Amino acid sequence: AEVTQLSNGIVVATEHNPSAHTASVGVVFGSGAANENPYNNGVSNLWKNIFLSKENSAVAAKEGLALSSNISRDFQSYIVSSLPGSTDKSLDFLNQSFIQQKANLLSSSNFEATKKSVLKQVQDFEDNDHPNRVLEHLHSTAFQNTPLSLPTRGTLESLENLVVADLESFANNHFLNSNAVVVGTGNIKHEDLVNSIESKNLSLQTGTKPVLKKKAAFLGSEVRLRDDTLPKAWISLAVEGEPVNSPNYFVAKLAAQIFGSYNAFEPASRLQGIKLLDNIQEYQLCDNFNHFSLSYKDSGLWGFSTATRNVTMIDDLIHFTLKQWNRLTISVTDTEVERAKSLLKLQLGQLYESGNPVNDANLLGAEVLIKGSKLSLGEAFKKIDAITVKDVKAWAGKRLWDQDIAIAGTGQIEGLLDYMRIRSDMSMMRW
Template identity: 35%
Template structure:
């Protein structure tokens, strides 16, 4: 059966004769093989190179407390050789196509992709399929990579912003998949063996959990042919997996229909540090929520600011103007992080004026409260322009487009086009922002993560009380 999207002229492709399910969006074309394997591509006019890769509908969230970090280990050893290629041969074949191979793992998915010339796309797809389907998984390979994994963990600890956000997730989603780090605890890093990795791969590398993505100088028909050649024999999950559904491990001790947000805090006080790093958040919205863009606009109303910016004194955000005037912070950024079935919405700030930490948190939450009562259409219009610039202009390369296609499909089941984004953002009104804030911000529990000289950060209940103060 062939199904095509509306709102455009349609031509029946030859894929219809091969029992494939094919869709053509305004730009992104998708085809599903009989075994559930998905192919998605977007041709970028004028592009001289192609980015192709496989996105996997499984990340660290699919792990449990005992094997947390396994997806990251698999990402590392995938480049160390396959059943038919030694590490040296794999590297030589990668160099032969002149490609730039990359991989990453996040909470909900993993990706293995490369940039190459159009004529090298077939070889690139073959290499990636071999790396995923025939990875050499043995204890000697894992042990050889152990030092690199530990060095990666140390690098994350040295990244204070990442550390704060890791702890923010850990306290907000305690003992749940979203509360665990991508790298995993040190005890797991040194103890994971081929048993854990093999079990993870056997569940993750399934036809209905993979998307072959192409962006740039690519042809969709060619990618479909390559997918049939290299992935048509891959089995599907039992029971069948569906994109956009909960990513939690079936072996996790804490199983919920959706993650449970817990109002709580974690404080890592270190008075030897010159700067305090603090994040405060409420439960956010999922990527498929009808309020997704409203939450993005609400965050943009609060805005981002840095004392280093040449326009620090002239930004439209009221909190930015106050920070520039009072000089009580070095920077702040609002965020709306969304996952398959939940999210985190909040603010992250840094300050070296440790006796005014309470001022920063107090005035930030005061601006949050104003979203419930007095946000203006002018504020919303400014925020909408910022959101559109961030979401649309960020797709400035084939790599970025490929990542957006891959993550969109595995997380929501479909790719939202730039035109849809623009229309959805444009529809957001001040009344919608107020309604969203009254439901999701006013008198809601918060999660706090703080690192550094944080003695001036007042107790949790004092900060929590600011969530319901409506007048000053």
């Protein structure tokens, strides 16, 4: 009823949900793509896929279990889902995969087949997923030569050069008890899980701490992947944002909610209380846009992504959007701040109070790894309601006004002006 957190060597964290009809048990490691290098980039993604390999999944399915794995920038997860009663069967599989097995999943035929699978996977993403590919390039240029610049799926070049040894090296260096948290969500009790874990013994690399490196840094820059054969222009643009556990974490998320998301083809989306919408609908400057406040351990990105077929008016799209951002520093109104509060609460509620145990597992593990605990919506909502117009203006004057930007784009971006023209729009002339 408040999320329990116990440690006996292995940190166990659970979140009991009485309305849930299933249960998820897994392990979340405090290491992701941000802990790789340009040459082993994609190793985590390769691990995810061998864990989700047919051999491993068939074994789990026979037991009535479903496997899930997510590779993020700061973390990595491996979850098993089952009925509330088969919760102990999940632990056995989990125990087996990360303690008993090794040479079973890393066999020549399984590794090569899995490698070939992720290779075609990544190739398709880079070849067809334009909005996400652009967002990945935003991170790449914004944090270039820094941990946060590496794509989570890895790069084709490094992927084709990866061997079983690379996987093992990463596992020995990151899949450690000191860098992990065993999570339990859905319909399960803490005692049931802690005792079932405390039932077994061993340690498997005890006291071993993960590798350390240099911190993430934001660099005003841009990467342009022009492709005149594509039907649209896809653009992502952002300034240095807030890291997780930043004092302005919510103020930044609220600022992003002010401008929000938009889908020109959805009737209700066109009626939102967003001033930018009055400027962009007259000549239909875009098909959609979405503002974000991405937060990581060392840094973050605040900005937006947009897609448009109006290739001759991209300059107006960017101009109007950045002119609106200017407003956060000098003229954002009370009702805009109040509307943002309500919608932010709804966003967080939908994110944290989702009816999915695997989602809760990922969120719970990631947070307890970073701050040792998980913040409740009750506390989050209180912080949000305390945000004032002066807080937004103070934050904007620091993060937005006359600040460097990172830009990424693909498709028909001839109309996207030079860096300086876009950068100049981060402020307004004053007397």
